[PDB]
Amino acid sequence: DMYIERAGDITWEKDAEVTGNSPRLDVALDESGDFSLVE
Amino acid sequence: GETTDGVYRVMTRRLLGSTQVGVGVMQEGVFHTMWHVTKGAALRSGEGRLDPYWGDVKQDLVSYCGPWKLDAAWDGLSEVQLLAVPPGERAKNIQTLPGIFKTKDGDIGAVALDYPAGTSGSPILDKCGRVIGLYGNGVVIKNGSYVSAITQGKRE
Ligand SMILES: Nc1noc2cccc(C(=O)Nc3ccc4c(c3)CNC4)c12
Q: What is the three-state SS of B28-74?
C-alpha cells in the first residue's frame, strides 16, 4: 500500500541554484512510454 | 485526508523500511503523478483513500480523484524551475534552461538535471509558479546521466 506525505508549496523561488545544460536530442517514444536515443 | 494544494512524496512500506517511489502534485482536489510511480495502484492519504481516475502508459501520466488539471506549457524560450523532492531530502527549486527532445510527432522540452528515480513526478514550473509538466520520463545519455522530458497532460 502506497501513501502520500506533503513536501511543500509550489512556488517559483527567486535566486534559486541555476544549473544544467539544454541539449537537443533525437529521441523515439515506444508504446510502453519508454524514450530511446536515435543516432 | 490531506487534499491541500502542494507537492507530495509517494511512499511505500512494501520494501525495507519506508521507501519513496516518487512525487506528485495536488491541485483542485486531484493528485497528479507519473504512471510508473504507482502502476495505477490506489493511494492512502492518512485515513482517506485516493482512487485512480485517468491514466495512460504511453504518456506516463495518472490522475487521482478527478481528471488531469495541469495545462500550463513551456513557452520554448524561458528558464524553468524543477521543484525537486528527492528521497529523504528537502524540496528544493533548481533553475535550468530546457533542451529539446525531437520526436517524429513534434518537439518536447527536456530538463537536464540528474536525480534519483524516486524523484519522478516532481513538478517543473514557469515564472508564475504554474506546473508545466512532471520530471521522471526521459533518457540516459552517453556518460550515464538522466535527461527527462517536461511531461504534460491534457486538461479536458
Ligand atoms: N532510469 C532512471 N535514471 O534516473 C532516473 C530519474 C528518474 C526516473 C528514471 C526512470 O527510470 N524512469 C522511468 C521508469 C519506468 C518507466 C518510465 C520511466 C516510463 N515507462 C516506464 C530514472
A: CCEEEEEHHHHCCCCEEECCEEECEEEEECCCCEEEECCCCCCCCCC
> Resolution reached, in Å?
2.3
Indicate whether B87 belongs to any domain. yes
Compute the distance between CA of residue B72 and CA of residue B82 in angstroms, rounded to an integer. Answer: 14
- B49 in a domain, yes or no? yes
Residues with CB under 6 A from ligand 1: A 32-34; B 36, 60, 115, 117, 119-120, 136-137, 146
CB neighbour list of residue B46: distance below 8 Å, 6 or more residues apart: B1, B2
Mutation choice for A interface testing from B20, B44, B77, B83 by most A CBs within 10 A = B83
Experimental method: X-ray
Query: How many angstroms separate the alpha carbon of residue A15 from the centre of ligand 1?
Result: 29
Kindly state whether residues B89 and B128 are assigned to the same domain: yes
Domain limits for position B113:
80-149
